[PDB]
Amino acid sequence: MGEVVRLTNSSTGGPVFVYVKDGKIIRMTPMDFDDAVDAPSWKIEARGKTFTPPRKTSIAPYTAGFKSMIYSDLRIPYPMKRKSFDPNGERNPQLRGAGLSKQDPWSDYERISWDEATDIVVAEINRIKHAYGPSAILSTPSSHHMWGNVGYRHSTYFRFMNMMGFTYADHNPDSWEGWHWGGMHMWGFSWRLGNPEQYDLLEDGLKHAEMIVFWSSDPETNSGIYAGFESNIRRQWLKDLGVDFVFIDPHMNHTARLVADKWFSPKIGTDHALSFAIAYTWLKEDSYDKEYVAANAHGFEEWADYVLGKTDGTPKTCEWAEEESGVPACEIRALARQWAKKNTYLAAGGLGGWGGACRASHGIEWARGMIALATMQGMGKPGSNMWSTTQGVPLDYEFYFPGYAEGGISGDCENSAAGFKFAWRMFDGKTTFPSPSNLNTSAGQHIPRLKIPECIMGGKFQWSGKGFAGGDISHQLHQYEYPAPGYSKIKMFWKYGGPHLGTMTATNRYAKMYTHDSLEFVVSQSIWFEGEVPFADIILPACTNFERWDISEFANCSGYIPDNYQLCNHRVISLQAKCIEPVGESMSDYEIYRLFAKKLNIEEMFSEGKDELAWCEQYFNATDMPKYMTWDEFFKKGYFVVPDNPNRKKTVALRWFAEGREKDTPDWGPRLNNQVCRKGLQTTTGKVEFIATSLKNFEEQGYIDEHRPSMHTYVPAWESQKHSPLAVKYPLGMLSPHPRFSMHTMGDGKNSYMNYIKDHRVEVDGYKYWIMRVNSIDAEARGIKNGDLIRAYNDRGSVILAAQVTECLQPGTVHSYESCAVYDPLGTAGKSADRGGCINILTPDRYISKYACGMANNTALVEIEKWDGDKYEIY
Amino acid sequence: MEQYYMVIDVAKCQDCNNCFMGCMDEHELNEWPGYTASMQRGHRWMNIERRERGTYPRNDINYRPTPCMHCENAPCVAKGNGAVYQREDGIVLIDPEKAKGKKELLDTCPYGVMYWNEEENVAQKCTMCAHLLDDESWAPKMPRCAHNCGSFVYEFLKTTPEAMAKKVEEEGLEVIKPELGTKPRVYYKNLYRFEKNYVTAGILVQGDCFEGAKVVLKSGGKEVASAETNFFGEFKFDALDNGEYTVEIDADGKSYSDTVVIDDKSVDLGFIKL
Ligand SMILES: Nc1nc2c(c(=O)[nH]1)N[C@H]1C(S)=C(S)[C@@H](COP(=O)(O)OP(=O)(O)OC[C@H]3O[C@@H](n4cnc5c(=O)[nH]c(N)nc54)[C@H](O)[C@@H]3O)O[C@H]1N2
Ligand SMILES: Nc1nc2c(c(=O)[nH]1)N[C@H]1C(S)=C(S)[C@@H](COP(=O)(O)OP(=O)(O)OC[C@H]3O[C@@H](n4cnc5c(=O)[nH]c(N)nc54)[C@H](O)[C@@H]3O)O[C@H]1N2
Ligand SMILES: Oc1cccc(O)c1O
Ligand code: SF4
Ligand code: SF4
Ligand code: SF4
Ligand SMILES: [Ca+2]
Ligand SMILES: [Ca+2]
Ligand SMILES: [Mo+4]
């Protein structure tokens, strides 16, 4: 009926040009710039060369095959209702997931209209609010979402929910665990949840870098986040400049596999033994920045005596560290000597912070160990800093464009970063208003995402901190309880998505909670029929961002990661065009909520008479875009390449701190009140506290926590091979990083093209199994061969996997990505082995420490064997 | 009469699978009349070979994206009975209709790049997105793999045989199975990473990694390679053909030598304590 039209949209894997014909998406590709209309790129002159980026964007694997997710046959077809669920009769809570228990998920549901589906949910909402109150309505989406600022959870979800209920299951700082509950007490950066700023580090590195230590860092795979493969050419530049690359990772990750000069594979939970041995070496050889430390460190003298083994009687030698980690002493020492004498940047994690190492039982000490090392070498001075090569791009930090974390249309000043700047631009206190929540606040009621099962099945819980406690260093130390004083226990659960079985900890418990009789109603508002969805009573079909109108900037999260668009080679702002009509009977989340708003008699207040496109234009006008083009011109062009800002002065991350002067970067902290004359870190002393004053106060107040000492020390990882009694039964150390070929659950399964990738899933007799990498020596010892179906197990459950024999792991260590989207129990749900590949069924649900209420997934002890075909219904 | 050529740099493959996802995106849900029916799930028109080498802790891995070689002297055109033809620009294409009902075509391929489509009852394979290359509207003017790369692996070009021959000699480009004489137009750069092997080790002196130790590799007694150990005391001699070699090491006047047998495997001599 027509011709092919090139449209624009984006995703968690990068912006894309979308070719559409007769209402069908033909292909999705990376973006080519048009030098006739797109501003020129930045240039960096360094060491005799001129570096400039490619005139194009790039995309991740899961975005390249994203079309198969849009047209997935596992896409939720239309509103669905659990057959065995009768709102006015037998609710049969015990039959939730029954289909799943008989390996026939779909048969559990019957089709129903949107009108009846919403009427049922509304009846439940009103009954529960008048009997127990809005707090009895539990709800939570999850960490990630389809790209698009207006439709993002911080925007649409919150705007509606804040007007309806509700008790939020606030998210634990998953991404930051170690840095958040640990590093924060040592150097602050609460507004970044423990991670360091990264401004203008690319040029500094190109000019001065001689070596980079990638610790728990796989920039290629992770890209920092949302940045496709934008940084690949930057490391190519560094490599060609003669910069050595050393990788310390239990698994020889993908970046290491490509450009490693040397690889270390430490046993799980033993990284801080290496950091301590490197420090010991610098102290014994006087090979560190004493002047720097004398001015910017607190409690270093006491810490030094600990590292030297004076106070505990155990000198932290490279030999001592070899016995702990399996990494050769000589190599540990050689790296220490090279690090000291060369301009070395510490690439802790793939973002400049983060790192799977941070969300493990040794997460706190790893994070502090990284800060300790980078501190000793004078981070901030030319040629020395914490930089993971993914950020620091010279983009125009002065141009303002909101990241999704800034709240969009919700204006929620407490649950989004709208309070920093966006809220003031987006709303006028005259014609458009925000949607605040008087429940999702400290004085209200929320529960930990990591402990939803315990709250539902146990009816009670007590913990530390509320979600992302980035307000100040001590906010995470605040004590909470469930149910909160005066509030009601959960009666209803409104789920947005359903990934927890593959993304949380010891996940069989998330399956178990659904059948508890205390749970009167479970609604699932999702896109694909997978994971947790087959446990709901009512299912509502949402659509992908390719089927609705939105707007966004390449990788721009902002909020707890201020100006993270610096992960890309260019700032690309694009219109997310509605490329096709919603698939099947699905609709945008906003339209779903608008329908509910109408039936809840709050339509006007919720929508303000605006549709998604209307909100997009208003969003557009609240940014700096109008300085370059009107909405109409932008809508027409489809995307905008922010011009370079050649003349702005460069402010390298932490240099101001290194030089003892006033903070001068564009960072969102430290707040003026957390500094004396705006100098120093957010910490009390304004220095790097090896003995954290905040924690020392906490422990002196009576909150004794052995696994989170005020002084950064070698706390043996509670789930490691030589320190846990569990190692007797489960001798193998397993780490489970983020999936290479999927943005967490968004890519895997769904009958997507990604499932055909060799290193993602292995087909065995018709079923594509999740992969677990095993060192040849451990495979051989178990009679396991490449391609065999194996059973990974421990006290928490069993998971069937396809074995991949490799040399990319130190013997005794196994590797299997997390975030599996497929939950496929071989027996009763939550009580049998899963063959979908939900490795998180095996990870420890114990908090990192008594008060550090974060997930410790990457240190899990397991045992594996060839699968005998049994279903193992023993959990 | 300009022809198409493609150059793949093995040293730069990270196996993110953007290529593969690129075909699928282009061929699984789409039909291209005159070129090919829709692709079958599970097929690998673009087959990214994976090969690990050596043993922990001095192991490594390399990848070889393998599409259709569209070789100049194509066996399936010769033995395809007209179901396969060669264009003037070098592209080798299967006739979507003439090929139906003939599973025998797959065997005319020394590289095994074609796959049988059950639903279409026909052999299918790499078309070098001839449909895209034949359409001016496709601004990129290159296949989907190459266009989807974010690792700068692909170099797509349309030039004369002379210019390509010149490029081959300057960059030392190679092809898969040259001995068969099909003359692929898809070249590989740094192919030794995937086809050859290496010998490596870590030299220690008084318990510490020794930097600057002189290492020499010999075959038949004559030097084949040499280098000095880095700060980790390591050296690595790659691109080795199968055979026996001798490694000689001199550090602080202290010498060490041992033999090494390379048999389609790379060897880690481990720590050499001097
Ligand atoms: N072993 C181990 N476990 C880990 C980690 C680790 O390193 N190791 N990493 C941890 C970290 S950092 C994180 S961030 C978590 C990830 O935790 P998440 O909960 O696992 O992961 P997502 O896959 O982003 O899930 C978001 C859900 O929202 C739904 N959704 C997305 N977009 C939309 C939309 O527009 N509308 C609707 N209605 N639904 C939508 C999706 O379908 C999906 O089910 O995993 C953590 N778990
Ligand atoms: N393809 C893809 N990209 C993603 C994501 C995804 O799901 N898929 N997730 C996005 C999100 S939410 C985030 S938060 C960022 C994550 O970005 P990062 O946090 O940088 O990812 P890593 O944390 O480095 O995960 C750890 C890497 O460290 C290794 N590792 C794991 N545990 C340890 C340990 O204890 N010690 C050491 N030395 N190494 C360890 C693993 O082998 C892995 O390669 O990634 C973003 N990018
Ligand atoms: O994965 C992290 C990165 C950005 C925002 C989040 O809410 C998160 O959990
Ligand atoms: S897209 Fe490029 S780096 Fe990725 S697997 Fe294919 S050739 Fe390799
Ligand atoms: S690789 Fe095979 S299919 Fe391609 S042209 Fe050569 S012989 Fe024919
Ligand atoms: S050239 Fe086109 S058909 Fe050939 S492998 Fe590449 S993407 Fe596929
Ligand atoms: Ca140094
Ligand atoms: Ca390689
Ligand atoms: Mo995260």
CSV table of N, CA, C and O in Angstrom, one decimal, chain A residues 590-651:
chain,number,residue,atom,x,y,z
A,590,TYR,N,0.9,4.2,29.7
A,590,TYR,CA,0.2,5.5,30.0
A,590,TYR,C,-1.3,5.4,29.6
A,590,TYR,O,-2.1,5.9,30.4
A,591,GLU,N,-1.6,4.7,28.5
A,591,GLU,CA,-3.0,4.5,28.2
A,591,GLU,C,-3.7,3.6,29.1
A,591,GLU,O,-4.9,3.8,29.4
A,592,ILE,N,-3.0,2.6,29.6
A,592,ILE,CA,-3.5,1.7,30.6
A,592,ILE,C,-3.9,2.5,31.8
A,592,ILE,O,-5.0,2.4,32.3
A,593,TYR,N,-2.9,3.2,32.3
A,593,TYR,CA,-3.1,4.1,33.5
A,593,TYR,C,-4.2,5.1,33.3
A,593,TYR,O,-4.9,5.5,34.2
A,594,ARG,N,-4.3,5.6,32.1
A,594,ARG,CA,-5.3,6.6,31.8
A,594,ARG,C,-6.7,6.0,31.9
A,594,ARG,O,-7.7,6.6,32.3
A,595,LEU,N,-6.8,4.7,31.4
A,595,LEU,CA,-8.1,4.0,31.5
A,595,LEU,C,-8.4,3.8,33.0
A,595,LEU,O,-9.6,3.9,33.3
A,596,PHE,N,-7.4,3.4,33.8
A,596,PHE,CA,-7.7,3.2,35.2
A,596,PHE,C,-8.0,4.6,35.9
A,596,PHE,O,-9.0,4.6,36.7
A,597,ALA,N,-7.3,5.6,35.5
A,597,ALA,CA,-7.6,7.0,36.0
A,597,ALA,C,-9.1,7.3,35.8
A,597,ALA,O,-9.8,7.9,36.7
A,598,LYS,N,-9.6,7.0,34.6
A,598,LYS,CA,-11.0,7.3,34.2
A,598,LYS,C,-11.9,6.5,35.1
A,598,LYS,O,-12.9,7.1,35.5
A,599,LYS,N,-11.6,5.3,35.4
A,599,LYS,CA,-12.5,4.5,36.2
A,599,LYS,C,-12.3,4.7,37.7
A,599,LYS,O,-13.2,4.3,38.5
A,600,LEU,N,-11.3,5.4,38.1
A,600,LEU,CA,-11.0,5.7,39.4
A,600,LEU,C,-11.4,7.2,39.7
A,600,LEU,O,-11.2,7.7,40.8
A,601,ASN,N,-12.0,7.8,38.7
A,601,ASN,CA,-12.6,9.1,38.7
A,601,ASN,C,-11.5,10.2,39.0
A,601,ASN,O,-11.7,11.2,39.6
A,602,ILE,N,-10.3,9.9,38.4
A,602,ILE,CA,-9.2,10.9,38.6
A,602,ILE,C,-8.5,11.1,37.2
A,602,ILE,O,-7.3,11.5,37.2
A,603,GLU,N,-9.2,10.9,36.1
A,603,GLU,CA,-8.7,11.1,34.8
A,603,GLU,C,-8.1,12.5,34.5
A,603,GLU,O,-6.9,12.6,34.1
A,604,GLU,N,-8.8,13.6,34.8
A,604,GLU,CA,-8.4,14.9,34.6
A,604,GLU,C,-7.0,15.2,35.3
A,604,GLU,O,-6.1,15.6,34.7
A,605,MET,N,-7.0,14.8,36.6
A,605,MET,CA,-5.8,15.0,37.4
A,605,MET,C,-4.6,14.2,36.9
A,605,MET,O,-3.5,14.7,36.9
A,606,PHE,N,-4.8,13.0,36.5
A,606,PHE,CA,-3.8,12.1,36.0
A,606,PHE,C,-3.2,12.6,34.6
A,606,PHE,O,-2.0,12.9,34.5
A,607,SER,N,-4.1,12.7,33.6
A,607,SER,CA,-3.7,13.1,32.3
A,607,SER,C,-3.6,14.5,31.9
A,607,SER,O,-2.9,14.9,31.0
A,608,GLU,N,-4.4,15.4,32.7
A,608,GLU,CA,-4.4,16.8,32.4
A,608,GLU,C,-4.8,17.0,30.9
A,608,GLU,O,-4.4,18.0,30.3
A,609,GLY,N,-5.5,16.1,30.4
A,609,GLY,CA,-6.0,16.1,29.1
A,609,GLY,C,-5.0,15.9,28.0
A,609,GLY,O,-5.3,16.2,26.8
A,610,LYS,N,-3.8,15.4,28.4
A,610,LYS,CA,-2.7,15.2,27.4
A,610,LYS,C,-2.5,13.7,27.1
A,610,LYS,O,-2.7,12.8,27.9
A,611,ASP,N,-2.2,13.4,25.8
A,611,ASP,CA,-1.8,12.1,25.4
A,611,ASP,C,-0.3,12.0,25.5
A,611,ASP,O,0.3,13.0,25.8
A,612,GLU,N,0.3,10.9,25.2
A,612,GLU,CA,1.7,10.7,25.2
A,612,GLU,C,2.5,11.8,24.4
A,612,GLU,O,3.5,12.3,24.9
A,613,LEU,N,2.0,12.0,23.2
A,613,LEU,CA,2.7,13.0,22.3
A,613,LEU,C,2.6,14.4,22.9
A,613,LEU,O,3.5,15.2,22.8
A,614,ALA,N,1.5,14.7,23.6
A,614,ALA,CA,1.3,16.0,24.2
A,614,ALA,C,2.3,16.2,25.3
A,614,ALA,O,2.9,17.2,25.4
A,615,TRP,N,2.4,15.2,26.1
A,615,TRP,CA,3.4,15.2,27.2
A,615,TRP,C,4.8,15.3,26.7
A,615,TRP,O,5.7,15.9,27.3
A,616,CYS,N,5.1,14.8,25.5
A,616,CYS,CA,6.4,14.8,24.9
A,616,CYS,C,6.8,16.2,24.5
A,616,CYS,O,7.9,16.7,24.7
A,617,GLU,N,5.8,17.0,23.9
A,617,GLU,CA,6.1,18.4,23.5
A,617,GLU,C,6.4,19.2,24.8
A,617,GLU,O,7.3,20.0,24.8
A,618,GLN,N,5.6,19.0,25.8
A,618,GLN,CA,5.8,19.8,27.1
A,618,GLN,C,7.2,19.4,27.7
A,618,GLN,O,7.9,20.3,28.2
A,619,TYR,N,7.5,18.1,27.6
A,619,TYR,CA,8.8,17.6,28.1
A,619,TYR,C,9.9,18.3,27.3
A,619,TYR,O,10.9,18.8,27.8
A,620,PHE,N,9.7,18.4,26.0
A,620,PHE,CA,10.7,19.0,25.1
A,620,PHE,C,11.0,20.4,25.5
A,620,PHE,O,12.1,20.8,25.6
A,621,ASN,N,9.9,21.2,25.7
A,621,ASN,CA,10.1,22.6,26.0
A,621,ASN,C,10.7,22.9,27.4
A,621,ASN,O,11.1,24.0,27.7
A,622,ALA,N,10.8,21.8,28.2
A,622,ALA,CA,11.4,22.0,29.5
A,622,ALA,C,12.9,21.7,29.5
A,622,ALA,O,13.5,21.5,30.6
A,623,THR,N,13.5,21.5,28.3
A,623,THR,CA,14.9,21.2,28.2
A,623,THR,C,15.5,22.4,27.5
A,623,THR,O,14.9,23.4,27.3
A,624,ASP,N,16.8,22.2,27.1
A,624,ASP,CA,17.5,23.3,26.4
A,624,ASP,C,17.3,23.1,24.9
A,624,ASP,O,17.8,24.0,24.1
A,625,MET,N,16.6,22.1,24.4
A,625,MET,CA,16.4,21.9,23.0
A,625,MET,C,15.9,23.1,22.3
A,625,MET,O,16.3,23.4,21.2
A,626,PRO,N,14.9,23.8,22.9
A,626,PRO,CA,14.3,25.0,22.2
A,626,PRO,C,15.4,26.0,21.7
A,626,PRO,O,15.1,26.8,20.8
A,627,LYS,N,16.5,25.9,22.4
A,627,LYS,CA,17.6,26.8,22.0
A,627,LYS,C,18.1,26.6,20.6
A,627,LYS,O,18.6,27.4,19.9
A,628,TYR,N,17.9,25.3,20.2
A,628,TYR,CA,18.4,24.9,18.8
A,628,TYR,C,17.3,24.6,17.8
A,628,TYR,O,17.5,24.8,16.6
A,629,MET,N,16.1,24.2,18.3
A,629,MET,CA,15.0,23.9,17.4
A,629,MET,C,13.7,23.8,18.1
A,629,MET,O,13.6,23.4,19.3
A,630,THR,N,12.6,24.1,17.4
A,630,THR,CA,11.3,24.0,17.9
A,630,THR,C,10.8,22.6,17.9
A,630,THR,O,11.5,21.7,17.3
A,631,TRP,N,9.7,22.3,18.6
A,631,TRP,CA,9.2,20.9,18.7
A,631,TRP,C,8.9,20.4,17.3
A,631,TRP,O,9.4,19.3,16.9
A,632,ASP,N,8.2,21.2,16.5
A,632,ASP,CA,7.9,20.8,15.1
A,632,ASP,C,9.1,20.4,14.3
A,632,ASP,O,9.1,19.3,13.7
A,633,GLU,N,10.1,21.2,14.3
A,633,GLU,CA,11.4,21.0,13.6
A,633,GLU,C,12.0,19.7,14.1
A,633,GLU,O,12.5,18.9,13.3
A,634,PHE,N,12.0,19.5,15.4
A,634,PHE,CA,12.6,18.3,16.0
A,634,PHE,C,11.8,17.1,15.7
A,634,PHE,O,12.3,16.1,15.3
A,635,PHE,N,10.5,17.2,15.8
A,635,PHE,CA,9.6,16.1,15.5
A,635,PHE,C,9.8,15.6,14.0
A,635,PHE,O,9.8,14.4,13.8
A,636,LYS,N,10.0,16.5,13.2
A,636,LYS,CA,10.3,16.3,11.7
A,636,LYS,C,11.6,15.6,11.5
A,636,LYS,O,11.7,14.6,10.8
A,637,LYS,N,12.7,16.2,12.1
A,637,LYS,CA,14.0,15.7,11.9
A,637,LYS,C,14.2,14.3,12.5
A,637,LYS,O,14.7,13.4,11.9
A,638,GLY,N,13.6,14.1,13.7
A,638,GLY,CA,13.6,12.8,14.4
A,638,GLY,C,14.8,12.7,15.4
A,638,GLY,O,14.6,11.9,16.3
A,639,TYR,N,15.9,13.4,15.2
A,639,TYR,CA,17.0,13.2,16.1
A,639,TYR,C,17.9,14.5,16.0
A,639,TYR,O,17.9,15.2,15.0
A,640,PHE,N,18.6,14.7,17.1
A,640,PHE,CA,19.5,15.9,17.1
A,640,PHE,C,20.8,15.6,17.8
A,640,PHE,O,20.9,15.0,18.8
A,641,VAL,N,21.9,16.0,17.1
A,641,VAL,CA,23.2,15.8,17.6
A,641,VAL,C,23.7,17.0,18.2
A,641,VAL,O,23.9,18.1,17.6
A,642,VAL,N,23.8,17.0,19.6
A,642,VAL,CA,24.2,18.2,20.3
A,642,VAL,C,25.6,18.7,19.8
A,642,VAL,O,26.5,17.9,19.8
A,643,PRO,N,25.7,20.0,19.5
A,643,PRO,CA,27.0,20.5,19.1
A,643,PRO,C,28.0,20.4,20.1
A,643,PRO,O,27.7,20.4,21.3
A,644,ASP,N,29.3,20.3,19.7
A,644,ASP,CA,30.4,20.3,20.6
A,644,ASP,C,30.6,21.6,21.3
A,644,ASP,O,30.2,22.7,20.7
A,645,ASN,N,31.2,21.7,22.5
A,645,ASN,CA,31.5,22.9,23.2
A,645,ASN,C,33.0,23.0,23.4
A,645,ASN,O,33.5,22.7,24.4
A,646,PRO,N,33.7,23.3,22.3
A,646,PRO,CA,35.2,23.4,22.2
A,646,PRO,C,35.9,24.3,23.3
A,646,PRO,O,36.9,23.9,23.9
A,647,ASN,N,35.3,25.4,23.6
A,647,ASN,CA,35.9,26.4,24.5
A,647,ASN,C,35.7,26.2,26.0
A,647,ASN,O,36.3,27.0,26.8
A,648,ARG,N,34.8,25.3,26.4
A,648,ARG,CA,34.6,25.2,27.9
A,648,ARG,C,35.9,24.7,28.5
A,648,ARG,O,36.7,23.9,27.9
A,649,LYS,N,36.1,25.1,29.7
A,649,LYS,CA,37.3,24.7,30.5
A,649,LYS,C,37.1,23.3,31.0
A,649,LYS,O,36.0,22.9,31.3
A,650,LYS,N,38.1,22.5,30.9
A,650,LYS,CA,38.0,21.1,31.4
A,650,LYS,C,38.2,21.0,32.9
A,650,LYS,O,39.0,21.6,33.5
A,651,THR,N,37.4,20.1,33.5
A,651,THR,CA,37.4,19.9,34.9
A,651,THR,C,37.4,18.4,35.1
A,651,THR,O,36.4,17.7,35.2
